[PDB]
Write a protein that binds this ligand. Structure first.
Ligand SMILES: C/C=C(/N=C/c1c(COP(=O)(O)O)cnc(C)c1O)C(=O)O
Ligand SMILES: C/C=C(/N=C/c1c(COP(=O)(O)O)cnc(C)c1O)C(=O)O
Ligand SMILES: C/C=C(/N=C/c1c(COP(=O)(O)O)cnc(C)c1O)C(=O)O
Ligand SMILES: C/C=C(/N=C/c1c(COP(=O)(O)O)cnc(C)c1O)C(=O)O
Lengths: 387, 387, 387, 387
């Protein structure tokens, strides 16, 4: 019954007002005492087998359950409209757990759609976790699926070029196979993959959910079956989210709508000014005219986002000079933060990607922050004029 | 040239006094800016391929390098007398990385000697990470080794029964295969597996290294080849140790010698009093008479430790009543903390272990803390007399 | 040359990008080593006598200087356009330091204009710190000033009724006496009291500057003379802001403009809906028509704010029932947070105030958060209809 | 019924085991919601008037009550055997509150015995808080007392020269006037001033109670009357201890007996080696022969302590050469940490002290840590031999 702006502030804050406290406490306890051998043992088995902690039951150990992490999990699950959510140390740890869950189930094959984040792409290419990958285009998903396929890894807008994918078509092509959508760039503010029929939704909480570049994290909003499988892997592989990391990511969700709306407004205006510059040939931004032929803005995405990628006319040398002459905009990886960042994907985020699949050498990715539009445009224009 | 007691206080504190600060700072930065595309890209590749951060180089991203974690890593490596060390979110994440490093190298077979911690035992039994295991006795290690073997996993004193293993004999039997010794129970204060020829030394930093039951962690002190392999896995799977977790584990190392020496003294006295009680049939404690036939105390272990396991005369019912009637001693999992804890291993820590390999039903594990010996004995005796 | 929205993100972040880090580190060091007796001693004297730490000098001790606190201090001083700023544990500690500085200078008399926060009002009334106070109206400031006066204390919008004060007129009436302006409610986003000629500007950083209800703090943006006096008191009375408290308050400044602008928009709309309700007789909100006769909105305040006070028609019983029937809006003290709070000032914030000076029994104060306007209005209307 | 070693581990940990948690949680909440206007208002008045929070009552606001601070308060009060305890940001904030409590009661005069820490000394000399002072010798306390006297401030061993004071004689001479004893150097492990009849016992929790040089703090263990007065001052002046500061000082109490016993053993041996060196003329350490004529060791102090001061034969030049040539031992202020520190008191800790009352120019103070005795002696001897 409440709007998403209200649910970002009060999500995962259940029972705190009733207990006479304002924010969730940070419990650093590694162990959690048990009342007796029978209840302690049953709670251990329930949690180790991937189940949610029962109300009025001991967490037993942090690798089995953490209350602060659990609050962050229920907060994001409510925003994505998923049954449950499982949080890990990083976005890669969440990807690792989802791949190990599929391998453990007897479905090691993965049908993935490029572009994807460099690490997600490299982890599937190497097959470190016993996975086999089949790189397929959006239209050729149904054909690429084998009896051995466990998941369909997709991402929209893609990292770095912001390639869009119709989630309704992907779910239709996947059939009985579950679809994993990496909704890091859009966030639950702009896109809700669960509504389109995605089984699991991955987020690199490090970006946008944290929002201040000071909390690493990874989280998958999904149904109870996949949450149980992810928790089974988490309890034995232990890629845990620290109680303070969970606190800051949950804290960041309270300002996610106001931060996304402010950065999106700045980005929509910057993409127009940057397209007009002669040094830039192509500007990739969903909110621009022509960039949305399938009509996914409105239907799937309630906004253009705060990420802008661009192809330089002078190729690699112009792209290199552009990031090196930025002063206010900082040359660094990561996104969704309070400050504006810029980077060459082929040299940093997508460096472990295969040569054939690497992004363009003239391409530059930018994360728009909460600074004034004029000060960011002045700095980016001066950097382009330096070449 | 310095004693281990001095190195626990000043280890990993290099350059802090020279910078005008007392303790290492907690840098929560997820990203780390780069000077240019060339140096940033080269630093990314150097770190992603498992190398140590060069002095005067950007960390690029937290999943590649964290300075607070690095200080903890160098502090423990110096205590174990290893070349380097790699830290993770939990002890299970460190085990996971070591197993994935062996599988990635083309050696998925592991030769492990029981007893081991329930999770370490279950992770090998299930073969979640693409590993095959051959459970062998200490004397039958050489015969159990195949051309496909990547590691020899041992633990001494074993969790929970405190079974001792001659590390010189295990290294001799392994030959060309590297040996991984879990030194969680002994700590670098009491045992140095690197000196016996172990290639890698695992520690659940959650216990003893942290010492206050408020910091989860895992760390492997090893040579440069295995450290590079572990960091390659850590960079892509991301089971990272949070900057505050690293701060508290590093902080805990400063008091590790004084905490271990105090708890060991209390444990040596408790094991004698508990052996004299009629309710207890067997008291497993290395420092006790008859428990050390091979003369490993002095030679391998400088002391008896602060862990005591015991077999109850009345079986499961006496073991159950003993932990349920403890008041000062708390019924909970985990060890090496400031407080004394007690638990039934077959019901909790070793619950995911196979029925044939599970510990005795009358066995009880106890972690001795920093409380007065008389107050702990009074509580444990009253709990035994309650049945 | 930069806009205030840009300066909130990058303020106090000097040298971090150049050092290869994203956010300021949290240095918990209580002590700071010295190079020699001469430089250490001179740095001790320089800091103990209220001076700023020199570049390339030891902080010596945390009670003399803390670097994380110093970054927060320079960030807010730039936002208020003050020379320097001094931070303390709470807003009351900052008030205490300012009153102690005036008493130490030989000017214990204070001219204060009501309404003020309950604690600020009570601390002056009791004269705990050796002060004498003369409660004067805005027009009668010049007459109330004595040769013994050290400060003129004003607050606009006042806590709780939001009474406005013309700062240009107050500065003119004070003359040689410095004016302290508590700018907690307006924040540097909406008011620049230093521009009007205020010597010192006080903020309860706990509210708005922190913004998430999880960091207590107090800070005074002022000239070098008063900053020196405040630091001299801080070094000997030690009401220090903890390094983590400074980190979160500095972190909160990065989203201050987007949080204030979102809550102000919601408040301007709520004040019109609440004025139309029959249960409420008077709604105090500067943005509302008729509430600004002196035209201070535009000239002094660049916005109406996110605080709304109101007088119930049914007196105390209606005011009591209104806060007790709120569900989404929480009955609690404090303001400027991500969530909407409500409280009866005469019973809580202004309870230590003298009976004659206490606010109206039918008056209720409300802090507007970042929730959707419809969900907040629905809850507040239902609470009024419950009576 | 329990020993002090047991009470240091389990003190202030009441109800945690019963709630299924290991360590106390860190609640950063600035505000605490109230059930209704009547209970909220009554809880506000009860806390603002200096009373302890009732069980099952809202804390209302952090400046009135904090639960993590409260657990640290009850933990130390039990160790000192006091009724209650009040914690502040620093040791100077606690001194400030006690002095303001005496001034507020109508007893501004103080009878203080030197030597005292430079800050305590200077705060009394300046009379910043409206406090008159009469510097008296231990034997002349009774004569120095006026009808206006509110407190008798003493410290043993004194900072820096370790001068001992007979607490039984001081209490007898004070009579009706309460005695404040600064027990920072001895800690509740070695001295219990409450047993000798002291009304209030101050500690600079920054030293020894924290023990790792990363948590500033101040605390006074006292009867209910003085605790109420101290809390009345704390609620209005707000020199609060941050929830994380409270957590680390409480955490530090768990290892206080093992840290004190280890550093005391190292110090007793170092004082003997340093006395034998020709460069040092006098070694002030209570345990050494002749340094305790009144027999206070055993009767009042159960140990010599971990602080050593000494007079150099070459005067100031030898004293400055000694601290400047130390490498392992660090030249810095503060004490009771895991590492060994050294400093010239007249130039640093006691620099704001009057020239007549300042310590000797050849005097050097040293805080002994948890490093090996041989490594500390080797470094200190080499530093003396450098001159
Ligand atoms: C270097 C960081 C960047 N990204 C990461 C990322 C991850 C992986 O998330 P952790 O980094 O493991 O929390 C997953 N999915 C997406 C769409 C991502 O952007 C970056 O692009 O700049
Ligand atoms: C429940 C925890 C206990 N142990 C853990 C542990 C680990 C694994 O370490 P993390 O628990 O993942 O940090 C590895 N190796 C050993 C010998 C261990 O004791 C326990 O038994 O009490
Ligand atoms: C209970 C807290 C509230 N405010 C306090 C406050 C302070 C004092 O700020 P510390 O509370 O000392 O940080 C100073 N100045 C103003 C205008 C304030 O509103 C409140 O009213 O809800
Ligand atoms: C510079 C610091 C030192 N001392 C402090 C101190 C305090 C004052 O407490 P905070 O320092 O404010 O926590 C109170 N009481 C005693 C006996 C102290 O030694 C020091 O001596 O090295």
């Amino acid at each position: 019954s409440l709007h998403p702006e209200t649910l970002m502030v009060h999500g995962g804050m259940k029972g705190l007002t009733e207990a006479g406290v304002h924010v969730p406490a940070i419990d650093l306890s590694t162990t959690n005492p048990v009342n007796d051998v029978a209840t302690g043992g049953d709670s251990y088995e329930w949690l180790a087998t991937g189940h949610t902690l029962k109300d009025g039951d001991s967490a037993v150990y942090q690798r089995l359950w953490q209350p602060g992490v659990a609050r962050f999990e229920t907060a994001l699950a409510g925003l994505e409209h998923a049954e449950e959510a499982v949080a890990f140390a990083t976005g890669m740890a969440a990807m690792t757990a989802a791949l190990l869950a599929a391998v453990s189930a007897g479905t090691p094959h993965i049908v993935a759609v490029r572009p994807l984040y460099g690490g997600s792409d490299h982890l599937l290419e190497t097959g470190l976790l016993g996975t086999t990958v089949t790189w397929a285009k959006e239209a050729d998903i149904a054909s690429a699926i084998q009896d051995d396929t466990g998941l369909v890894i997709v991402e929209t807008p893609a990292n770095p070029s912001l390639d869009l994918v119709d989630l309704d078509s992907v779910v239709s092509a996947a059939g009985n196979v579950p679809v994993l959508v990496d909704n890091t760039f859009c966030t639950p503010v702009l896109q809700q993959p669960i509504s389109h029929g995605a089984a699991l939704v991955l987020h690199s909480a490090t970006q946008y959910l944290g929002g201040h570049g000071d909390a690493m994290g990874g989280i998958i909003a999904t149904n109870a079956d996949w949450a149980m499988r992810l928790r089974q892997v988490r309890a034995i592989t232990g890629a845990l989210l620290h109680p303070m990391g969970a606190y800051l990511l949950h804290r960041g969700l309270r300002t996610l709508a106001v931060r996304m709306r402010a950065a999106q407004t700045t980005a929509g205006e910057l993409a127009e000014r940057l397209d007009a510059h002669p040094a830039i040939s192509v500007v990739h931004y969903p909110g621009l005219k022509g960039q949305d032929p399938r009509g996914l803005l409105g239907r799937q995405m309630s906004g253009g986002g705060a990420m802008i990628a661009m192809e330089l006319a002078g190729g690699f040398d112009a792209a290199r000079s552009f990031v090196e002459h930025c002063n206010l905009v900082v040359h660094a990886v990561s996104l969704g933060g309070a400050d504006t960042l810029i980077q060459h994907p082929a040299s940093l985020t997508h460096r472990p990607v295969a040569a054939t699949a690497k992004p363009g050498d003239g391409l530059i990715r930018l994360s728009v922050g909460l600074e004034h539009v004029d000060d960011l445009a002045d700095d980016l224009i001066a950097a382009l004029d330096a070449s």
